[PDB]
Amino acid sequence: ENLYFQSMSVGFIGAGQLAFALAKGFTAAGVLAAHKIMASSPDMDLATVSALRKMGVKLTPHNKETVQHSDVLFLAVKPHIIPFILDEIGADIEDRHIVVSCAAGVTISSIEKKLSAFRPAPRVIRCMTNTPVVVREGATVYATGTHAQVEDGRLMEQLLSSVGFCTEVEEDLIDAVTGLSGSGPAYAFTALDALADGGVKMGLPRRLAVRLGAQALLGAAKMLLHSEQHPGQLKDNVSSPGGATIHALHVLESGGFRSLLINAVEASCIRTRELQSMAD
């Protein structure tokens, strides 16, 4: 509302799944006109690029053009690409820019070190988000850089709140957030596929089983978000004595279900830390 009237220009360096998801989310939110977004990519024959083209997002092979168009500039490329990108358009970053890095593991310090060689006070924000911004139910955290104004963090929270949950964190939490909510949707998609397989095994049509499993997970997550109760307490409320649910919970426990999800968060976090160590 107030952000739409700001008439912001947004740029994405990188035109893959995350850039498409955010562009789709921002336009569905009405905070940005699609034609006020510009995206660049070295490979213009990607499917995500054609989807962005149909939305009306401006597309170019030239990262400099994205930079010059943009007020808020998202870096949506892989971690090992970031230093080459900063070398290439570092001279084109202006005082008016806010540079938002979405690269997993890449530290504000490494970005500011590159950019400060060109102009002395680059405004940098580090972001970690996920694909459900496309349905305006993302989970986003951000940390502000050395030179990011207080108004810069409030602007970014306003923008990212339009497509889901958003909150400021200290940067040292972001690798862990990556393993939880960055990778989280993929754990859920895996779980939903498996639950549907279970529904089909027990005689449900696939379409119904997918719908029911997804509705179950959505409702449960919303319950927890609207409850101040522990998830174990909500689990207890579901499970009647001797009943169907408690029998199913036992077979999950017998396979170490809980430990697998802990293993997943840890593995994603650890990999995020070693992608940056390979950079560093």
Answer yes or no: is 13 a known binding residue: yes
Ligand-binding site membership of 16 (annotated): yes
The C-alpha torsion from 178 through 184 and 190 to 192, rounded to 10°, is -170
The helix (run of H) or strand (run of E) holding residue 207 is helix 206-226
Q: Which amino acid is at 193?
A: D
Alpha helices in 90-243 (DSSP H): 108-116, 150-161, 174-177, 184-201, 206-226, 231-238
Q: φ and ψ at 228, to 5 degrees?
A: -95, 10
For the segment 10-49, give every residue that binds a copy of itself (CB under 8 A). 16-17, 47
Distance CA 83, CA 33 (A): 30
Quick one: which of 83, 90, 153, 185 contacts a copy of itself (CB under 8 A)? 185
Among residue numbers 162 through 201, which ones bind ligand ZR9 (CB under 6 A)?
A: 178, 182-183
Phi and psi of 123, rounded to 5°? -90, 110
CB 178 within 8 A of CB 102: no
CA distance 167 to 279: 27
**Contact status: 117 vs a copy of itself (CB under 8 A):** no
205: contact with ligand ZR9 by CB under 6 A: no
Segment contacting a copy of itself by CB under 8 A, of 56-64, 65-73, 142-150, 184-192: 184-192
Question: Do the annotations mark residue 18 as ligand-binding?
Answer: yes
Name the token pair of 158. 């306003």
Residue type, 137: E
Binds ligand ZR9 (CB under 6 A): choice among 103, 155, 196, 265: 103
191 touches, from ligand ZR9, a copy of itself, none (C-beta below 5 to 8 Å by class): a copy of itself
Residue keyed to tokens 């690029």: 49
Query: CB under 5 to 8 A by kind: which of ligand ZR9, a copy of itself, none does 134 bind?
Result: a copy of itself
By a kind-dependent CB cut-off of 5 to 8 A, residue 102 interacts, out of ligand ZR9, a copy of itself, none, with: ligand ZR9
Looking up tokens 């997918």 gives 210
Residue 146 interacting entry, from a copy of itself, ligand ZR9, none, C-beta within 5 to 8 Å by type: none
Q: Rounded CA gap, 136 and 159, in Å?
A: 11
Chosen residue from 243, 260, 263, 280 binding ligand ZR9 by CB under 6 A? 243
DSSP conformation class of 179: I
Q: Applying CB under 8 A, does 84 fall inside the site for a copy of itself?
A: no
Report how many residues bind ligand ZR9 under the rule CB under 6 A: 17
Residues after which the chain has a gap (C–N > 2.5 Å): none
Q: Is 216 annotated as a binding residue?
A: no
Q: Which of 15, 102, 143, 148 binds ligand ZR9 (CB under 6 A)?
A: 102
CA 43/CA 199 separation, integer angstroms: 41
Residues 210-239 that bind a copy of itself (CB under 8 A): 210-226, 229-239
Binding positions for NADP(+): 13-18, 41, 63, 76-79, 102-104
**Binding stretches for ligand ZR9 (CB under 6 A):** 18, 102-104, 127-130, 178, 182-183, 238-240, 243-245
